[PDB]
Write a protein that binds this ligand. Structure first.
Ligand SMILES: Nc1ncnc2c1ncn2[C@H]1O[C@H](COP(=O)(O)OP(=O)(O)OC[C@H]2O[C@@H]([n+]3cccc(C(=O)O)c3)[C@H](O)[C@@H]2O)[C@H](O)[C@@H]1O
Ligand SMILES: Nc1ncnc2c1ncn2[C@H]1O[C@H](COP(=O)(O)OP(=O)(O)OC[C@H]2O[C@@H]([n+]3cccc(C(=O)O)c3)[C@H](O)[C@@H]2O)[C@H](O)[C@@H]1O
Lengths: 186, 186
């Protein structure tokens, strides 16, 4: 079972995610994409990253309509900063017969260096890069690519959008927008 | 009444369209965007557009959920190649008290020169340029700009996608995908 782990803090989740996952899904020839949400984002524990419960909620709304997208709360499986090396380690254990790939966008590609235990991690799983507008890939690390239309949208956009009351339409599912307004986020 | 005429042949209409329009609507402080479908695309009369009726049908689906998006079939009422001069002329007559702006993406911007009566049209109404990924703005014509998130997605993408059965999800309203599938398009 060829699976693509798509970790992210999704605060909030937006179309850009949906499109990349859905495109990587096809391009890397995967069976299902796994949206894995951080308990507490490793690279940002000093940034004020929404309570998790709302992230997993917003996440569930953004991916319901796609049969091939599946939630994965394995990192929510208990306390401490969610370091991919630790998680992937664990995952390769629960699912030893499945083919696993991790997915990141241009953005993170630039961050590979600052990233806990990347040299051990890269040995565990293979990485798939996409290419996000504004950032750019180039890494000196083993990484496979997947052509994916560039879509300029990041959560931080929406958050500011959602606070200065700017559009946010056609950038996040109409379901995710409501949850935010409803549950008072951003 | 501040209006942004958003002409296109929309074959098919896609999120890129929806996104740009909804942004320009904000960025240029307009009251509503008018999606204006060609009867027969001026700049490509020897290609294949799809009979129109479907373009208007697909167009109608894409913009239903947005109260500020409106359909304008003015060009559909009177035969022959839909030249923006002729039309904007007429428009500036039916609506003498409303503020009218036209809208194009980097795509069209590059094309301003090969464009029936630009010099006289430019006199009639003000254009608002966006910027599409792949193309790029630079023109020697009087044009205003509206910052709008780059979204690399074209109808010609979809058409090919919809015919080599590739994803198309998250690129066109799901209502638009159905119409195509049901009505045997592309
Ligand atoms: N338009 C777009 N086109 C393509 N991708 C886009 C995108 N907008 C956001 N994305 C991003 O969406 C995904 C994730 O969303 P987002 O919430 O922004 O992701 P983010 O919070 O920045 O972090 C990405 C993941 O990498 C892991 N990480 C990060 C840093 C350090 C370490 C470590 O162990 O040391 C691990 C962790 O699992 C995290 O969930 C991809 O990472 C991608 O970069
Ligand atoms: N991702 C994206 N980001 C921003 N904009 C994007 C876009 N993808 C498509 N678009 C385009 O969508 C809009 C229209 O859709 P589309 O079907 O592609 O538009 P298109 O068929 O290329 O032509 C644009 C409009 O210009 C007029 N025109 C064109 C050529 C010659 C003459 C003449 O007077 O001789 C007149 C005509 O009224 C038409 O409605 C904008 O033109 C924009 O460029």
């Amino acid at each position: 079972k060829k699976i693509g782990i798509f970790g992210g803090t999704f605060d909030p989740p937006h179309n850009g995610h949906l499109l990349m996952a859905n495109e990587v899904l096809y391009q890397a020839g995967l069976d299902e994409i796994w949206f894995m949400p951080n308990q507490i984002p490793p690279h940002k524990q000093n940034e004020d990253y929404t309570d998790s419960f709302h992230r997993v909620e917003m996440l569930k709304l953004a991916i319901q309509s796609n049969p091939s997208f599946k939630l994965e709360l394995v990192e929510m499986e208990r306390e401490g900063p969610s370091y991919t090396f630790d998680t992937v380690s664990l995952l390769k254990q629960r699912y030893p017969n499945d083919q696993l790939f991790f997915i990141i966008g241009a953005d993170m590609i630039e961050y590979l260096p600052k990233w806990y235990k990347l040299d051990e991690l890269l040995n565990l799983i293979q990485f798939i890069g996409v290419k996000r507008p504004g950032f750019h890939v180039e890494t000196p690390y083993p990484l496979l690519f997947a052509d994916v239309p560039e879509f300029e949208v990041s959560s931080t956009m929406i958050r500011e959008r959602f606070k200065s009351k700017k559009p946010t339409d056609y950038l996040i599912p109409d379901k995710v927008k409501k949850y935010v307004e409803e549950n008072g986020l951003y």
